[model samples]
Target: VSAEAVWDHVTMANRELAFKAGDVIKVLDASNKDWWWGQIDDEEGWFPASFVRLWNRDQMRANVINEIMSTERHYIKHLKDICEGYLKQCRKRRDMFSDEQLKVIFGNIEDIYRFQMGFVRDLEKQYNNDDPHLSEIGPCFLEHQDGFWIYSEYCNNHLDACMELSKLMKDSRYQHFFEACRLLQQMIDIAIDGFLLTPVQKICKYPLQLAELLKYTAQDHSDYRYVAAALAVMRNVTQQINERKRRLENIDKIAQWQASVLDWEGDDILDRSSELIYTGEMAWIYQPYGRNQQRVFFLFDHQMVLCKKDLIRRDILYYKGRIDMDKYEVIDIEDGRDDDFNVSMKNAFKLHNKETEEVHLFFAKKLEEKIRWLRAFREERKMVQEDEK
Candidate 1:
């Protein structure tokens, strides 16, 4: 069945779930307690369930299901290490575990392991095997014995022995598992820092990163509620911030351009009469960085009113912040497009292309960039409290 369908049955609950030890669980395609896990190693093959630790305390009912999958993930590395250890000692030894233990360990884990393998295969079909990160966590988070009642007893007596057994599993890098665990650890740290663990809704600081993480892990979450919360929070925060920023930028563009227009007052007379020149067909172009070449049209009266008379020319050198008289001609403002008007002040707000549009976008870009830079800088220092509200 689809993972979403599975998660729907598993993750959410009447009350949110928490990471407690000793819960029972199973892998995909495995019947009840068949591949299902029990304590630290008794049949019904006891897998300690402690390895299923979650990043958040506010978990869903699906924790039980997710716990099983997450716990199974932890064991693969340990198992691989165990096999490799045996391989080293015996060299070319196909027989790592005695037939009996393999039957217990791999047998118990097969349902979860096989399902992930198939899922990864399907993903590879779509993404072309490029994303190894998708499948790693499913195997590394196997059941642990610490603090858990059922499995703890077995591990208590056999703790030292199990560590020794760990030497036998092949210990190649558990890349996917490592990434998943790393993400978990980081999120947990973010939450514990108590710096407003909101979902990644806006493009601010950590939220963007969190959004991307959630997007990537959308299917990976065994608990659907986690994904839903992440989506809702991210959407809410981003929309609010973006809309407010947009409005602010729009107002600033008008104000700054108006001030720039005032500087064109070569004669005080130009200031008093220029009010007649602002029109719907003619508008000022404000270029902050000044790079585009090819004009849609030109206006002499509009250019003169801005005090930027040199920009009336066809050449690039004149309009780009260089005020040379030779660059433009001030012929009688021909075909004046609707001058001397009784129009409202709102008519002054003109339509814009790329460079002009950049007026508003520039502020947005600056804020987003600043937020991003500070996020990186603080991440280096592990200092999050500064940007937090």
Candidate 2:
């Protein structure tokens, strides 16, 4: 039995078994039929049998295929709604969302939709009013190989979309559009987790399902070769899915981390796409006011940040200031001899703000830290200048 819908509030003598929508459960006893005891994901207890649907071996395979097709159609419709309902309107109101950014994001989405349409059509034809059996398709269900490739292709191409969407969400001026996009993201997440994951998991489920069918089938059975061949194809698909899963996980980790941390508006002055190069505790010297050592320094590509560390909790760094590479010039000083400098044996660097002509001095306790900061600042400045050109 599979849960048709989520049922969270269940009162029973044995509380071990709890089921949610899309969960698969094994029926242990059907004595009462309506209120049967079952084991869901290894947890045993009784649940209302009405919350689930029971299917035989043949019907289960066909149902799985049908559910995928149904959900694919639903997914396509949601994509259409996003384009027609919000994205199209956003173009007219360019102040809300940038036209160029939206174009880059939607281009991949349109490609994904086009690819999925062909995928759905191919699968629909594969099972066209025919019994979904090994004999009907063949030992190798290679007919649907192209359909699976569509999933991988879309995932590979949509990395740009994630970055672009994250930028849009971070814009506080367009809160309405941001909120709407957030809601649409939730819908997309639900559709993927609920329906898309099932299809991939089905690749692994096929081997188990076929083993049950193979038990009833004798060596002399007419469709014996067909069943064996189908199992072979499923095992191959399972392997392919596993390989793709690993790649997707790696991509997801990098993408999600960058996107989530980009617009952290609290105290950090980290840019949307800037790469964090190096960070450690370093003492900065204030030259204008009697040379004072301040332990708040972080090095990032394109900028240098200064923050005050919490006294009670030394781990936290509160963002106080920043220096952009483009707006400032790095000047490494060999000696710390200056009119305002009280310390003579300190490794120092001067930040000259070109626009404002303001000079700020900072010192590092160790020569290694001083050299690293100087090199990173100079390299980042060179890159920033090259980008401007």
Candidate 3:
């Protein structure tokens, strides 16, 4: 195999390969991703893989295929280790967890192992067959890309999962079990969180490897369209997976917000949400001359809870009321146009609670501020409309 050196590498020892930029060298072994064994006119030694560029279409395509298959094979092994070695051993301890929190922290890893097992087989059969270098692997990716959504649940839970595992490990009882699981060489000085992170990492890699395949293949190649579409699909999958993760995290803050309010009597804010759309403050006016009601409103998945003020002690709040975001409308109160509304309004807008037929008015400090709040309402409401379709 041959690759061209794109960057200059000066050797410090005989074992290290020496080459200048634009030099074409023969690749002997690419087993090491970062460094590869190469030969420059019989002066053969190890060189940084990044220093060289594989410009040959077929060879470069083959290189990408090998990387995906090899990493995937190891990734499967890593998953197996998480389940068979760590989680299985942890289960035996019984003192820590297995029946409940263990599953939450591990997410759906065992299921993912089952999913990956078939994928690895597909790649191996396609690539390790007769005339392997010319094997068309694009369709394999397109066939499997949609199923990658399976990782979304895991990635969504990951932010919470890592936090839960670390907190559990803080307890001496759980610590004892994980401490023992770390003794394996595969542990590599890593703990449960380290292994748990691999799924998201690997999910993000699909687009990366696909891009390499797409980057090298010509428009005329048999696999170009397959690779191109697969790359686009894989990119979308990771994109949504990442967004789903952020939503999960925002939901947690809503939970904490529910907790932060001094006396919350309603159902859990999490009950209304798998996501937190937005949050902010405003002046809520119920009566023209009534005392001003300051609010720290929380826009949950499809509901907005209006919270009253806070003081010392973590800066809490008092839950006042809520607006079912789906059953609400925003209209300008026509500030300064109506005397009663204008007296209480400051850059105000009217929010109609459709269910109760109650008209609630709110105000921001500036017209732009009020417009921005309206924009948030528009976006959240607009998103639900898209979700419905």
Candidate 4:
């Protein structure tokens, strides 16, 4: 069996094996090199000779690296197109967004663009030479122990910042601005879907490619050591990718919950910058009507949202009060058993709104829950105060 390259989707007698560029195929019958039958990803069909490259093990290794580097470079350009091409246009329209809003939006886009450009540079260094510097090949633990950790931190923070910026576009006040940035929005989506996905895929692909390299390379071959070293590094890189992906899954879940259940309309622009701190079931009690037991509370940085569980359809939870953080205060429960309160409920607490000086009582299913909820409310309220300062 010989190796071949698939350049395009070439059809013969109404039958064709559709393939993309940089795809490798095995030549099953090389009697006719130009019009040889080939197998690609287990599909057997005839492909044109011009479409594929003649296999040379040494050349193949270089070709694969070159392909990876160019793919990375292409994405860098895609990012720039969004920043320079689309974003530049957004800056000129004063009516599109206020000066402050535009600053936030443009700042994020440019930051992402610059970071991706640097990432491409690193990919180029890894491609051009086998013994590229550690900085180019990415963090080496021997000299810089926190290299990968710092790298992951950079990725997580920057991606999160991008998500925050994207939220600004979703706001109704800025709907017109986003409409003007139609191309920029599409470009950002492509950056997330296609470009950002490349690094993880590239790191994972290197191991497979190195395995192929080892197969073709004799143990005594001079290049074997280089391939071995690269393989070792890439294997660790794959693991790092897996670790990062696992952490990112939590962020993905928050977004899914927001879109599906929360139905956050983004009426409050500040909510775009807010985060989901804690949310769970809790029983709320009214001060006057002590019998009313409600159980749906969402804790956020700026607000404590109370929702009444739908009675008819118990599965649905609706927002009852989007209570502002400054509007409410947590009153600790010293006793779960009291004569006046004990008659109706046990383990009762009060939520007081300082603005109106009104108090609302709430009951927890258990005494432990009461303490836990009280602590969370106090902590969250403190954080909000600190943020204000």
lDDT of candidate 2 over 98-129, digit per residue (tens): 86777655544555556556655665665646
The residue-by-residue lDDT of candidate 3 on 27-86, one tens digit each, is: 777787577787776467788875555646677777777777888988898898889877
Superior candidate under lDDT, 3 versus 4: 3
The prediction achieving the highest lDDT against the true structure is: 3
CA shift at 90, candidate 1, in angstroms?
A: 71
List, residue by residue over 340-364, the lDDT tens digit for candidate 1. 3222222222222332223300111
- Candidate 1 overall lDDT versus native: 0.29
**Candidate 3 backbone collisions, by pair:** none
RMSD of each: 24.5, 16.6, 14.5, 16.8
Q: Which of the numbered candidates is closest to the native, going by highest TM-score?
A: 3
Pairs that collide, model 2: none
In order of appearance, the predictions have TM-scores of 0.21, 0.36, 0.55, 0.39
Clashes of each: 34, 0, 0, 1
TM-score of 1: 0.21
Error of 1 at 68 (Å): 24
Give model 2's clash tally.
Answer: 0
lDDT of 4 by residue, 158-207 (tens): 45545646676577765554445555445543332234333333434545
Q: Residue 378 lDDT in model 3?
A: 84
Model 4 spans > 4 angstroms off: 1-140, 144-195, 198-273, 336-345
Q: What is the lDDT of candidate 3?
A: 0.72
Judge candidate 2 against the unseen true structure and give its global Cα lDDT, from 0 to 1: 0.55
